[PDB]
Amino acid sequence: NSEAAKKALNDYIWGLQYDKLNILTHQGEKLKNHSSREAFHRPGEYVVIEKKKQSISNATSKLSVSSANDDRIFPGALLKADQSLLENLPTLIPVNRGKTTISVNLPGLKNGESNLTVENPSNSTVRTAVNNLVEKWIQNYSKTHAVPARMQYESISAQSMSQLQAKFGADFSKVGAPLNVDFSSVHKGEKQVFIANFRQVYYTASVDSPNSPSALFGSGITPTDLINRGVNSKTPPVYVSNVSYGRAMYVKFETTSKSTKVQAAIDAVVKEYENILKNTKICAVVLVCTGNIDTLKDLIQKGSNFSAQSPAVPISYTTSFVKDNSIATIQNNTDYIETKVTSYKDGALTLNHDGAFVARFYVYWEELGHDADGYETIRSRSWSGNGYNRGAHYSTTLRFKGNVRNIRVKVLGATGLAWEPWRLIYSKNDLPLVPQRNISTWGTTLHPQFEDKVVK
C-alpha cells in the first residue's frame, strides 16, 4: 500500500520520455553571416574597426543566485524545467515534502555532523538548518580549520547584450542593469569594455541521490496531483542536488585603451599592462564604482577567506533530473556581432645633415588606404625630398599617420671622386613607425657616420 504509492509514483516518471540534452536549450538571436572593415582618420591615429559575426554555444551546469530567485533555492528544492528555469526564474512546486539528506563539505566535520536531514524540507527549515550547522562550525572548527575559497573566474570581452546573456545566463539582464553599460561606445570603437564574474565558493550543501523518485516526497501524494499542478512530460521537474555558498560579483571594466591584450591584463591582475590599467574604469555589484583598481584588489583579497561572523549567501546551485539523476546542463546558443578595434598611431621622422659632404636622402614607405568607391588599397610611397642635395644645416621632419607602414631608407654620402659619385652610408627596410625617429649624419667624406634614433 505504501509500497504501492512508491512504485506508482516511480511508475509515471520513468514513463515520461524526453531528450535531456535538448529540453534545456535556448536561442537568443540568430544573425546573418557578415563582416565589415572600416578605417577612420582620427587625431593621432589611423584606426581600423572591423566587425565580424560570431556565434556561441555555452553549456553550463552551475546556475546563479539573485534577489528574484533566492526565495526559490535550497538543497532538495523542486523546480520546473522550462522557460521559467531558462530565465533563471524557475517555478517551484508546492508538494508535500519528504525527508532529504544534505551534506555540507566544511573541513573538520566528522561522524554524522557532516550530514543533515530535513523531514519537511522548506526554505525556512532548510536555510535555518544549514545556517545553524555553519554556526556549529564557526565556534568549533573555524578556529583550527581554515578554508580559502575555490575561485571560479569567468571573464569575457563585451560585444552584445545577447551574448552576455549566453555567457553568464539570461538572469544577468536584471542584475547588471544599474552599472550602466554603453554598447554603442564599444561598437563605435571608443570604449573597450570587459565583463567578469567572480565566484568565491567556500562551502557546498550537497543532497544525496534519493533511493527512489518517491524518496523526494512524503506519503499522500500521487501521479495525478503532479499532472494537475503543471508537472508532466511537457515541462518536467528537476531538483537542486547542490548549492554553493560564498561571495560572487559582477565587475565591469571600461577601458579607453584599444590594445590587443586587455583581457590578459585583467586576468593578470588576479593571477607593461600597468599602463593600460592606469586609466581604466571599474564598476561592480556585490551580492560602489570608482575609477581605481585598488578597489578591486582589496575587494577580492578581502573576501579570499571565510568571515567568522555568520553564514555566507548562496551563490551557485546545481540541478539534477528526478528520472535518471544525471547532471542537468543548460545549453545556450546565440549569434552576435563581434567588434574588433585596432589602432595605428602616428609618427614622425626628423632629418639632420651635419656632414661636410653634400648628401642625398631616400625615404620610402607603404600606405594603407581606400580609394574612390571605398574599397581598400595598399600602395608604395616615395618622399619628395628624394634626389635633392642637402647642406651643412638641413632640417625637415616628415609627418606620418597610422596608415603608414614598412618604411624603407637609404642615405648616400657624396664623394669628390668622379667615379662612384655617391657612396653608401645606411640602408634598411621594414622600419617600424615610431612616434619619433631621428636620422642624423656626421663626419668626413672618408669617415661618414650617421644616426638611427628611437625617440618615442
Binding site: 568607391d373 574599397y375 595598399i378 608604395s380 621594414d430
Partner: protein
C-alpha cells in the same frame, strides 16, 4: 574578382581575367621599365613578398580590391 593579368611583364597589359578564390586583390607594379599586372593576395602587398615574387630589386606597387583598378596609370613613375 576581375584583374588585368599578363603572365609576362609587358609595358602594357590589356588582358584581364576573373581571379580565383584565393586571390583577394589586384596588383600593378612598376619596376623600372618592366610593368607587372597580376592577380594578387592583399597579405602579399608588401615590399619583401612583392620583390620576392617578381624577381625585381626596386619598384613601386599598388594593390586594390576592386575590378580593373590595377592599371598602369595608377602609379607616379
Amino acid at each position: 574578382l576581375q584583374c588585368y593579368n599578363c603572365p609576362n611583364p609587358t609595358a602594357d597589359c590589356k588582358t584581364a581575367v576573373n581571379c580565383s578564390s584565393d586571390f583577394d586583390a589586384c596588383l600593378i607594379t612598376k619596376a623600372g621599365l618592366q610593368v607587372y599586372n597580376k592577380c594578387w593576395k592583399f597579405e602579399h602587398c608588401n615590399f619583401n613578398d612583392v620583390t620576392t615574387r617578381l624577381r625585381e630589386n626596386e619598384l613601386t606597387y599598388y594593390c586594390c580590391k576592386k575590378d580593373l583598378c590595377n592599371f598602369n596609370e595608377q602609379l607616379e613613375n
